[PDB]
Amino acid sequence: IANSIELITFERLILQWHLLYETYSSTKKNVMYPDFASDVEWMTDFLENHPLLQPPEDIANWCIRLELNKTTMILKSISLESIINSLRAKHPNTYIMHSVENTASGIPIIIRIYLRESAFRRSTNTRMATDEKIAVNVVDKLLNS
């Protein structure tokens, strides 16, 4: 029970996060960061595996690429499915993508979260604010989920 009740935030389930400023289209090839180019492979697999989950037409061109820490997942007994479900429930504006949940050694788990224009509806939500500040705020909210 003590383990169950203790708060586990998303921030502690990742090794690194990169704000890439990229767009993904199921039919249109888009520019991608070089060192993260190979990512494309697993993304394709995800698209093949989940017919229902496909990129929306609302993508805002901002991407958050997260590397998950398998050791922490095993220690805390958190499955990737639970993380994805909770992230989607808490944050509906974002579009979630993940690699295979095999967790085999040598194949890190990568999660790509693409913002939608819903998060950018009124960039001047209170006062004139740029898109990248809004993206940073979304990242901060995501990590504290």
Partner: protein, 105 residues
């Protein structure tokens, strides 16, 4: 650090129309290559930087106030080797004047 060609000043990244454009106080805007897509980043397992102690470990054999140990040196065959305990992880590194370093150095 994008540097304007006309002036050696920094360019801001506008992030307009999906393409990075480097604006300067004098104008002279420049397009952005795909290597410039990354907005920001953060790696949580920072630990202790290697440059954090690079110089200190380099100078450790010559520092009188450092602890010694009676283990032999594989390279130069000296009875004593300087022992350095660094980091909250308490990493023990054995070094010598000849250049031997137990930390894969």
């Amino acid at each position: 650090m994008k540097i304007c060609k006309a002036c050696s000043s920094c360019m801001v990244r506008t992030y307009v129309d999906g393409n990075i454009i480097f604006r300067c106080s004098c104008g002279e805007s420049v397009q952005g290559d795909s290597q410039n897509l990354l907005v920001s980043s953060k790696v949580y397992h920072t630990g202790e930087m290697e440059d954090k102690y690079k110089i200190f470990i380099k100078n450790a054999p010559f520092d009188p106030t450092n602890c010694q140990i009676k283990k032999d040196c594989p390279n130069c065959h000296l009875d004593y080797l300087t022992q350095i305990c660094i980091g909250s992880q308490k990493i023990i590194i054995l070094v010598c004047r000849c250049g031997y370093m137990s930390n894969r150095g």
